[PDB]
Amino acid sequence: SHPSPQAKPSNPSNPRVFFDVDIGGERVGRIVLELFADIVPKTAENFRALCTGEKGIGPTTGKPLHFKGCPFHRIIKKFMIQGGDFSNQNGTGGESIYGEKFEDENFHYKHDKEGLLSMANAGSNTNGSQFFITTVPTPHLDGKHVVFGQVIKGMGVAKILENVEVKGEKPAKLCVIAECGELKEGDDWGIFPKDGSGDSHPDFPEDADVDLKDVDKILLISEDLKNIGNTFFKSQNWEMAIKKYTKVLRYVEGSRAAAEDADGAKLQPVALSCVLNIGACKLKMSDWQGAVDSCLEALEIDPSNTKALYRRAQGWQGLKEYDQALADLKKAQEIAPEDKAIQAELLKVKQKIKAQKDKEKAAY
């Protein structure tokens, strides 16, 4: 067996197909896959056709030979995600474009990395329509399952799938291939989020065209995304604003990790402002622990940030952790003694503590 291809794609002439994935009725993103037609032409072609649905209705199932609407029925964190049972949706059905089952074509490639596309089966020469995507190397499957493609965009969507809540191995939420098909050469990738916001960047920075070491370009992307987050903020859509600010932090994280210390420092102002904005949104939604956690993140960038101390004390008040709230506001006041909002909030918390202690000790 041969190591699986490191380049993405392995071969410019290999077909590319995609899955748009929904979880609990919400679009999570697109996964783009390379199919290894240069090595397993028959297995690749089966999967390609099931992405387009072009072969029509399966004779043995009487259902469309097509992945659209098909759930991921079996998911095991830190192993794989399995789907493709378009007829029974539970691992007992599906069929191939060649008949109910077809032969193991070859076992050329090793299951030696995450992101590999491989045929599910019930033993030798029992390939149908079901597949899995690995999320780790799975060499124990070598020689038993035909490896026939790899993820080339959207591994991060596959990572979200792998981490869904499950009962046994069945997702609690419906995880489905909402749309699917084949990308022709010259077709747009279609991997920006389909959320009407005008965002032209992939949700995961490793999928973006930009070198993550190019901090100046990452800064301009971050500003673009932050701006879109603010568009949502100004329309009170706290959830979507947080989504965009959070995406700025993914780009910032990837870049700071790839770049040198001093280059990465350039991104801190924009990261700080997005973490603060997220804390603001979480307070708007009464997510007290979420706010507290985001404020910490801010103080980990700027330990003297009075905005973050003030908001953290508000999050602590929601949790009814008034000692924590008092301490944060006292520290904020020391830094910013002229801040009237902080003066007033300290009085308010002191009154809350007294009232709480009075209620706890009062007796008829």
Curated annotation (Swiss-Prot):
It catalyses: [protein]-peptidylproline (omega=180) = [protein]-peptidylproline (omega=0). Residues 213-364 are annotated as: Interaction with HSP90AB1. Its EC number is 5.2.1.8. The keyword Transcription does not apply. Less sensitive to inhibition by cyclosporin A than is CYP-18. GO terms for cellular component: cilium; cytoplasm; cytosol; nucleolus; nucleoplasm; nucleus. PROSITE patterns: CSA_PPIASE_1, CSA_PPIASE_2, TPR, TPR_REGION. Keywords: Acetylation, Apoptosis, Chaperone, Cytoplasm, Isomerase, Nucleus, Phosphoprotein, Protein transport, Repeat, Rotamase, TPR repeat, Transport. The modification N6-acetyllysine is found at residue 170. Residues 18-182 form the PPIase cyclophilin-type domain. It holds the Pfam family Pro_isomerase. TPR repeats lie at residues 222-255, 272-305, 306-339. Detected in heart, thymis and brain. It is found in: Cytoplasm; Nucleus, Nucleolus; Nucleus, Nucleoplasm. GO terms for molecular function: cyclosporin A binding; Hsp70 protein binding; Hsp90 protein binding; nuclear estrogen receptor binding; peptidyl-prolyl cis-trans isomerase activity; transcription factor binding. One of its GO terms (biological process) is negative regulation of transcription by RNA polymerase II. Residues 184-214 are annotated as: Chaperone activity. The modification Phosphoserine is found at residues 4, 197. The keyword Repeat applies. PPIase that catalyzes the cis-trans isomerization of proline imidic peptide bonds in oligopeptides and may therefore assist protein folding. Proposed to act as a co-chaperone in HSP90 complexes such as in unligated steroid receptors heterocomplexes. Different co-chaperones seem to compete for association with HSP90 thus establishing distinct HSP90-co-chaperone-receptor complexes with the potential to exert tissue-specific receptor activity control. May have a preference for estrogen receptor complexes and is not found in glucocorticoid receptor complexes. Identified in ESR1 or NR3C1/GCR steroid receptor-chaperone complexes. Found in HSP90 chaperone complexes with kinase clients LCK or EIF2AK1. Two monomers associate with one HSP90 homodimer. Interacts with HSP90AA1. Interacts with HSP90AB1; PPID and FKBP4 compete for binding to HSP90AB1 and the interaction is mutually exclusive with the PPID:HSPA8 interaction. Interacts with HSPA8; PPID and STIP1 but not FKBP4 compete for binding to HSPA8 and the interaction is mutually exclusive with the PPID:HSP90AB1 interaction. Belongs to the cyclophilin-type PPIase family. PPIase D subfamily. This is Peptidyl-prolyl cis-trans isomerase D. It comes from Bos taurus. The gene is PPID.
